[PDB]
Structure formats: structure tokens, C-alpha cells
Amino acid sequence: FKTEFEFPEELKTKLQEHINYFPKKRQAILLCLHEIQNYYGYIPPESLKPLADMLELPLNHVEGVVAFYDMFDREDKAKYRIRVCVSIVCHLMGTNKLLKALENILGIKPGEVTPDGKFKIVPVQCLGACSEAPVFMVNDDEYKFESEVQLNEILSRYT
Amino acid sequence: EFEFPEELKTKLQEHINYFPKKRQAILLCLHEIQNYYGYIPPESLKPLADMLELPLNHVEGVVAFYDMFDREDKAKYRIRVCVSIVCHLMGTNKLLKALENILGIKPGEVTPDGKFKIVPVQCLGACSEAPVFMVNDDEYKFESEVQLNEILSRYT
Amino acid sequence: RSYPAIPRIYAETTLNMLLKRAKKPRVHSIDEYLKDGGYQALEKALNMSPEEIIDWVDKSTLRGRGGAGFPTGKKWKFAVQNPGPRYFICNADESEPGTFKDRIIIERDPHLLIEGIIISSYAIGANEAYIYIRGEYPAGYYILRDAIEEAKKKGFLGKNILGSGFDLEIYVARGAGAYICGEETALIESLEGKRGHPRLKPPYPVQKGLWGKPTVVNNVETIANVRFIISMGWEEYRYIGPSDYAGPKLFPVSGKVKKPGVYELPMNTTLREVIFKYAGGTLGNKKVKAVFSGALDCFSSEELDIPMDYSPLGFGGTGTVIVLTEEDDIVEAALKIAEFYEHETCGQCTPCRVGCYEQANLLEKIYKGEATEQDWEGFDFVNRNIQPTSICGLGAVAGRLIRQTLEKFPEEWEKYRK
Amino acid sequence: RSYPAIPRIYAETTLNMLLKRAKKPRVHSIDEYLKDGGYQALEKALNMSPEEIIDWVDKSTLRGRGGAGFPTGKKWKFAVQNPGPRYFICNADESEPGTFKDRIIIERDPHLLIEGIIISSYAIGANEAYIYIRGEYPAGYYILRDAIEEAKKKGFLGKNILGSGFDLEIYVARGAGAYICGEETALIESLEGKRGHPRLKPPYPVQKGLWGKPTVVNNVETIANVRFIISMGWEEYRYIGPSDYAGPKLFPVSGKVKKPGVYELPMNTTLREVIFKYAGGTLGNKKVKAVFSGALDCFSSEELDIPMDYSPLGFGGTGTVIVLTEEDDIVEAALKIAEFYEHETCGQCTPCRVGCYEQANLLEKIYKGEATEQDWEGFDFVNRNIQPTSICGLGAVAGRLIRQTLEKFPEEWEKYRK
Numbered sequence A: 001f002k003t004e005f006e007f008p009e010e011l012k013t014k015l016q017e018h019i020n021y022f023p024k025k026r027q028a029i030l031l032c033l034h035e036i037q038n039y040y041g042y043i044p045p046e047s048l049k050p051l052a053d054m055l056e057l058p059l060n061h062v063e064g065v066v067a068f069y070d071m072f073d074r075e076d077k078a079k080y081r082i083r084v085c086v087s088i089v090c091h092l093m094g095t096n097k098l099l100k101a102l103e104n105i106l107g108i109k110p111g112e113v114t115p116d117g118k119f120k121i122v123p124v125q126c127l128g129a130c131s132e133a134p135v136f137m138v139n140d141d142e143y144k145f146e147s148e149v150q151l152n153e154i155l156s157r158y159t
Numbered sequence B: 001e002f003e004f005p006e007e008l009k010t011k012l013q014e015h016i017n018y019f020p021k022k023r024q025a026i027l028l029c030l031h032e033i034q035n036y037y038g039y040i041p042p043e044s045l046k047p048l049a050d051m052l053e054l055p056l057n058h059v060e061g062v063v064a065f066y067d068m069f070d071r072e073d074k075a076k077y078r079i080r081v082c083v084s085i086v087c088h089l090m091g092t093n094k095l096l097k098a099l100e101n102i103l104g105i106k107p108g109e110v111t112p113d114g115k116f117k118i119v120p121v122q123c124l125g126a127c128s129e130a131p132v133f134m135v136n137d138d139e140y141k142f143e144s145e146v147q148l149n150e151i152l153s154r155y156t
Numbered sequence C, D: 001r002s003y004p005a006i007p008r009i010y011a012e013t014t015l016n017m018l019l020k021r022a023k024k025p026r027v028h029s030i031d032e033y034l035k036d037g038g039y040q041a042l043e044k045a046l047n048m049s050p051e052e053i054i055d056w057v058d059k060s061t062l063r064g065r066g067g068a069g070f071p072t073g074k075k076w077k078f079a080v081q082n083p084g085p086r087y088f089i090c091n092a093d094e095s096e097p098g099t100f101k102d103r104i105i106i107e108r109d110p111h112l113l114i115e116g117i118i119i120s121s122y123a124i125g126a127n128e129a130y131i132y133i134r135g136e137y138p139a140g141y142y143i144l145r146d147a148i149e150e151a152k153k154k155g156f157l158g159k160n161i162l163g164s165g166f167d168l169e170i171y172v173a174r175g176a177g178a179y180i181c182g183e184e185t186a187l188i189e190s191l192e193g194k195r196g197h198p199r200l201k202p203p204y205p206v207q208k209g210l211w212g213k214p215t216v217v218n219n220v221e222t223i224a225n226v227r228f229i230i231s232m233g234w235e236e237y238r239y240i241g242p243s244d245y246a247g248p249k250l251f252p253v254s255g256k257v258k259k260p261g262v263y264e265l266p267m268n269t270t271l272r273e274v275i276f277k278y279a280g281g282t283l284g285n286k287k288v289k290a291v292f293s294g295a296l297d298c299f300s301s302e303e304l305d306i307p308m309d310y311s312p313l314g315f316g317g318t319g320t321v322i323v324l325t326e327e328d329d330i331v332e333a334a335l336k337i338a339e340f341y342e343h344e345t346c347g348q349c350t351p352c353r354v355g356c357y358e359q360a361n362l363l364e365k366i367y368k369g370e371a372t373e374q375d376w377e378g379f380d381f382v383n384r385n386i387q388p389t390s391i392c393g394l395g396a397v398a399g400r401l402i403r404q405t406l407e408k409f410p411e412e413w414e415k416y417r418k
Ligand SMILES: Cc1cc2c(cc1C)N(C[C@H](O)[C@H](O)[C@H](O)COP(=O)(O)O)c1[nH]c(=O)[nH]c(=O)c1N2
Pocket: C063, C064, C065, C066, C067, C068, C069, C070, C091, C092, C093, C094, C095, C096, C179, C180, C181, C182, C183, C184, C185, C217, C218, C219, C220, C222, C223, C392, C393, C394
């Protein structure tokens, strides 16, 4: 049956590392949240109570922070987040062709997850690679979009 | 005629008084003399011997045996360049070529002004940072001519 | 080790300073850096007093590269007039559309930045510095972490650095989606473990910033210049480029050009030159219609002969050049700028909060041909009314570019009003 | 104060004993040393009997780190069988090619050495102790002088140390360019004001040494273990690494690796692991051709699976690791080893005096392609006949490595002979 959520050991250790890294524990909130999102494929809402304990912070504070920062997601688990730039330069150079190709390959639109929980398209603002527009990221990896065939090959690397 | 300048005679007496026995201070004294003159004056050995209560021939044997001491070439700044195995593998020749490009001299030779002398030495105990060289007491890894040029410019 | 994949942004320099290594699209570790005279300027700095370093940076005429263009030396002077402890922050949030200049220094020549941070920290008496890097630059983050370790190994960081008595530790923090965290007070709020809400100024960070103590925030590119000021001397530095806008400048060029990328150029270079002499001209040799200075200003084809400096008649901003050509729709482009501000307003101020949203909402209806007459008039009104009560620069500028498009491209807007 | 410049030798430990502080490239002074329980072993040692300290060191299985590998406790035991007064000597001549392990303790954690010297001295009833440090470690010398003054002012040296009734003074002597001065009897002669000429043994120093009195000479690294043995007890000490060959060991690694520096590791570690797990693997990822254990042994690439211990089949020596890869010329390298022995024979013994010179001179002829058939046969002959009549180990080993290269790389030599 149900139990009070606890972090797995592997993760609890990485979390404690970030908290020990800065002079004040609360300064590690964002590194901790990036780590949680990396481990679960999202931010579980139940994970916020015990992160608050470890940060010696009120829960509402942690929740406010989670809500403010756009990289964090509490709704949709995904193995691979496909961040697609929808800002000015990528728009002019073919954001729409990249999304079309993403729909043709994966069968999904911005904001949706593939049925298997593997890929979620996440529209983002300028990714700071405007010369290589249109730009997308797959988790931490970042690329220029060239064509459907070239895109498919990139995606074939995530398994 | 040769007496030591006072500031130095004082410094030598310090060494001679530091060990329980005077003779034990020969090497420190010789390091001090060489520091002061940029070399070991042959005529400096006589009165040094008096202060250590030793014969001159003993002092002469010691100078001749210990490689760091030089009685032939006065130099303000001695560039000790490692020529042993690890520094050789990692680019002793590039350091020397780069010394030669900058200073106009090869190992053994003093510049005309007597500012820099290149001294090839055995392993300096810093093989991880090969190729290695000293300028007097300062020790450095050689990276490049550009980097070497700016180190040497610190010595005037 | 393996870092995340990065696109190979093209780089080119006529000055061979900031882009000396970073013009090569790979990581340059400490040995490569040391081989080119790396950390030698640091060593020379530690033999100078902190006061002299401030004076050198002051006399060099270096100005901030983050957008406000505040004299760097004078910022340092303001900070050191207040009791310590003092803190130093390198701002690596670079999240403005079109701007990708800071990242190529971080990802390709990290030590150029770290060396800059240490001198600057020493200059202001700060024993704790931070790099705040946007969360969408993961590779940069890992490159900086590894590079900081290399610096410790060679004793450029830690306690009693090189016998100097100066102690320093650089911490790397990551952002998580907010452009507003590039604003220096919101940056500081984020580093204290909070939401990136800009603070009311005064007080300014140099008197009260991180934990209420004097804080110098400086941009990556600004800090990357510090090595050269010390190394060459303030006098030789000031001889680079025009004497009134001295030093190397990085210009991120994107959009409808043959050779998009970062260019290191003097600031007496004209906008026409950036596009046509360096960036290879336009795709298809089509005419220039407009150049967006990031999401800040919009220049027309008639405004190309202006210097890429911080003169009133100059290009301004951060030197971000986005080229649109004759077939690009200005209203569609304006929509994209509107959407950006819509997504990045923190919401603390009511005219910013509601104006950013309404500007984008109404402009979307105009572009899709669904706008009523009252929506047209409302759009015009909200565009002029984002700034009131605003406590940071976002609100002041969220309508600026779009307003210039309305003034400089009326015929294209009128087409939509019909 | 200010000390001469030193390169920042990289250091890494999995054990966090000898390199706990010395992994950081800076001088750790007495207050910093005291903070982590420095000088507490001394305090404990002074409340124990001399004989019990000897027993603990005996049972720890500590062996000398200077090359001859003599059990440290048994050595102390032998010295106190003979009437006093007795002398203790720390050997800091470290002049063998590739070996830079001891200097990083001298220069970074001096108090680790001083603390061991005082305990060791008390154990053998020596009231007078010496550090003999090579003359090309000028920084180490001034660091030890200042650090000895620190101990005196904090009451660890001088008369009636901490109420115990035990007097100790520590004198610091400098070498002046002779590797033979690392040989314990030559060391002693140098300390007596003379040329560094080894003495015929027996008598051995523990019976007749400095001024003909019982004298213990230990290597820097050896003495650096003493604090730990008293602090943990002998039982916990033997739990470090393999039980047969227990304790921390420093490995200075140089040549064609990615991460050259000093590694603190247990002695079950293989040679392959030093190179590939710890030191980063090889430059360019090239194949290892050979490893020179200082100027003593040459290991082929077929011998990497050996343990870094004092076993019959182990690496042995002082754990010095110089890596040569597939494009390093073995003959060029052998020449460099021969050049070393030519420069360091003291010349007392005729086959050593003559053979070290001829091996170098003839090998140089071979290398440059100017050797006659007789020079080749003479080279072979001399290489086998340096050792006869020699009264110290230099003459015993000056041919060893080179002989091994001849046995293990015949084809490369044959090429030179053709
Ligand atoms: C909305 C918004 C966003 C940003 C900024 C401002 C505002 C209003 N600023 C400027 C920042 O507050 C500050 O002026 C500089 O970081 C100071 O450094 P320099 O003086 O330019 O070196 C800013 N600066 C920077 O270095 N990187 C960035 O991404 C941003 N982003």
C-alpha cells in the first residue's frame, strides 16, 4: 500500500552533494530540482515536501520556485524532452518545418507526450544558438534542424 | 688581500654557528658565497677555510666535487635546464632552442653582460612538469617560447 | 570527458583576442591555455595592489557588455567604497533572442573567463565568486565545472593563491527557464534560492546585493576582456578600435545572412559592414528590410551606416544583429517579439504583467485577421503602457521594438488593419 | 613569507593520509596542521615508552621508501642495541630521475614530516636530528626552516618538550648537486663537512654513522607514515591495502600519461591501473612501450599486471613510474639513463668510475651511428662490468635498466647495430 515518499539512495546522495556545494543550503534548490527532474523524467509533487526538509525551507517556498521556473514540469513524465525554439530567429528559419517533421516522425505536437512516455515536445524561447536556426535540444544535447531525414537519424540515437 | 664584505661575513658566521660543529656548515657557506658573487671566487676559499677551522685543500676538494658550485663563470641569474630522461622525452630540446632564440646562447655559455648562464643539470625532481628549468631558486615548467619570454622578462 | 552535443557556431576575428582560441569550435583545456600565456596576466595582477587593478580597468574605458554599458572600473570603485565581505558574479544567463556570444567563450575558452573572474574578484576584495549560467546551457555548465577543477590543480583558485594571500572559490549555479534572471537583482534573488523577482533600486547591488553585501555583477564578455587589460596594460588596450569606444567587441549575427555566427570586430565597424563585409551578405542576395537588435530595437535598410558602438546614433544593445530581408513579414516578426515578453514578464508590476500578455494576445488576433476595431486601438494603447510603475528594464522595453516597426513599417501594418 | 616559485605538481589520493593536505599545492602552516589533529600523535608518543613505539612501528610492517626497503622498526631496534648518543636523519636528497614524491610533503605539509621526525627521534633516544635536502630544492629548505621555527614556538622542539624530559633540535642541511649524497653513508659524510663518498659497509650506520655513533637514516616518505601508525595504532594501519604489503604509498608518474603527478594509492594497485585508471591513460591513447622504474628497472608492456608492492614479482623500487609509448626510441632513452650514471658515479671504485663513463660514451657512439664493431662489443662488455669491487649500490645498478632494454627490445637495438 502507500507510504511517505522517500528519495532513492543514488539520488539522495547527489542531492546532498548539491546542498553541501554552496555556502548556504537553500542556494542549491535549482540544482536539486534539475536532478529530481533528471531522475524521474519530471518533478513529482510529493518529492517537494522532503526536498524542503533537506533545504531547511518551507514547502510553499519550494512550490513557488517550482512554479516560477519554466524548465521544470510537474505534469508529464518523459524520458526525452525535445526543446524546440519558437522565438524570432528560429521562426524565420523554419521552426514550423521542424515541428512538421517532428509530427511526421513521432506523431505528436508541442505540449504532447508520445504514448510510450519516451518523447515530449516542449516549446521554449531562444536557446542561444540563433546562427544554427532552427534549433532544438534532446535533453542536454543541442542541434540545428536540417531536414526530416537528418532529424530522424538524430532521434534514432535516443532509445 | 681578499676579505669578505661584512654583510656576508655576518651571514657566513650564522651558518658556522648553526650546526654543533663548524665544518658541518661548508655547503651552506658555499651556497651563500655563490649567491653573493654569482660564482665561487677561488680566492674566497682561503679565508672560508680559516672560518671553518679546516685546511684549504679540503675546501677545494669540496667545491670541485659538488656540481652546483661554479668557479669559472660569473652570472647574475643561472638558468638550470633539466637534461635527464623525462624532460628529454617531453621537450628539453624545444626549451633550449627557445632559450637560444631569446637569449642568444646554448648550454654552458654566459651572455655578454653576464646576466644569464645556461646550466644543464640532472633530474630536478619535478618530472611531472617536464620540461623543467630553474632561474636561480625559482622553478617552472616550460610551455612555449611566448610563455618563456614573459618569465625571463621578470629577471632584470 | 564527453560533454553534451553543441552546434558548431561559426566564429571569426579581425583582432584575435577573445576569439583567439574560441574561433576553433572545441574545448580548450588548461594546457592549451597555458601554452598561449594563460594565467600569466593573473600572476601579474597578484603582484599589483587591488586599487591599481581598478584604476587600470577604469582607465581602459571598458564598458559593460550586458546592455547597460556601465563603466566597469567605476562599478568596481562603487562596490569597494562599501565595507566587505564583497561578492562577485559573472552573469551567464544569455537568454535574449539572437544573442549567442557569451556561450562560445564559455564552451571553447573557459579559462579566459575564469582568469577574468579571479583578477576581478581580487580587484574588489571578494573571496567568493559565482557564475550564474542559464539552465539551457548544460554543456557550458559541465565545461565550467571541469575547468574550475583544472584551475585548482594548477593553484589558480583556493587559499593563498600563488603565495599572494588572496583566497577565492568560484561556485557555478544553473538557471531554470527565466530570462528575467539575467537582470542583476533577479539573478541575485535566484542565487539566494528564491524566484527571480527583480528588486526595487536603489539600493543598487554594489552597495546591497547577495545577502545584502556589496556585489559586482559583470557580463561574461566584459570579464573576458580583463586578461587583456592587465596583460597589455590599460594604455595599449585603449589603442584598440576608436579611442572613444575602445576594445574588442563580439557581434552575434543571425537570420538571412550567408555566414551566421559570432564576429570579433572593432566598434567603429558599421552595421552595413557586419552584414555585407563579414557575414557574407544576405541569402539569395535579397535586400535587407530590417535588423533587430535582439528584442530591443528595429533598424531599417536606411539605418545600416551606423557604428556598432554605444553612441546615441550607434547600434547599441549587446551588438546582436538579426537580419530580415525583403520577403520577411514585419508583423509576423513583431508577433514573435511580443510572445517573448509575454513569456518572460515576472508579473510583479501590473502594467508589465498585463501589458506583456495583452500586447501578444491582441497582436496574435491582428496577424490572424480576427481583430476588431477596438482590439486594434487597444493594442496601440497597451504597447504604449507597459512601462508605468515598472521596477526593472523589461517593462521599460517590452513595447520598444514593436513601436519602431509601427513607425518604420506603416504600409505593412496598414495591410493588416484593412 | 614569500618562497621561491615551484611548479604545481598534480596530486590525487584514494586514501587521504599523506596527501590529505599535500594534495593541495600550497604551504600548510602549523595552525592549519593543528586544526586536523596535527602533533597529537607526538603528544601520544611522548606518553608511550620508546620501546613501545618501536614495537608499534615494527608490527605496522612499514618498510623504507628510499629504495632498499628495509623494515623500519627492525632498523630502529638495531640502533638502540648500541650505546648512545644516537642521531636521526631524514633523507630528502630525492635526485633519482622521475622521482618527485618526497618534495610535495616537504613543500605542502612540512609538519607531517617534522612530527614524524620528533616521534622517530624519541623512539631511538636521539636528541639531535637532521634533514638533508638536496640543494636544488631551495623552496623546500626555506619551508622547512620556517616550519621548524613554528614547532619551536608551539613547544614541540627545544628542551623538555611538553614536560616529557626529551630534548630535540632539528638542523636542516643542503646538498650541492650530487645524487650519491642520497646514499646513506655518503649523506653522513656530507653532513660531516666532506665530499659525498660512500663508506665500506659493514660497519652499517645503525652501529657507526655520524661521528661514528648509532645513526638511523629514513626517507621522507617513510617518516611521513609515523604519525599515522601512532594515531591509528598498528592494527588499523595494517588494514590499509594488502595485509602482506600494507600502508599508503606515493607513486610519482611522468612521461606519456594524460595526468602526470603524485598518486597516493595502496600497494595492491597494479601498474596498468596507475597508468590507465589513475593517471588518465597515455597521451594520444598510444600503446605503452615500456615503463622505467626511475633509473633502475625497465618494464615491458607485457609486465603491466604486476602489483605495485615489494613482492618478488612486484614493481618494487620507490614506485617511480616513467611511461614511454610506441614512438619513444628505447636506445635514445637508455642513453639518457647512461648519461645519468656517468654524471653521478663518485669515482672511488675503478669499474664504476670507468664503466659509467664508457657506457655513456660508447652508447652515444651507437646512438649517433659512429660506433665501430669493437665499440659495440666494448659497450656490451662494460655494461656487464660496472658492478665489480663497488662499495655502494650505484655501481651495482648502473648497468641494470640498460641491460633489461637489451633483453626486452633486441630488435630496436639490432636496428642500431645494422
Ligand atoms: C530583463 C533583463 C535581462 C538581462 C539584463 C537586464 C535586464 C533588464 N542584463 C543586464 C544586467 O542586469 C546587468 O546590467 C549586467 O549583467 C551587468 O554586467 P556588465 O556591466 O554588462 O558587465 C543581462 N546581463 C547579462 O550579462 N546577461 C543577461 O542575460 C542579461 N539579461
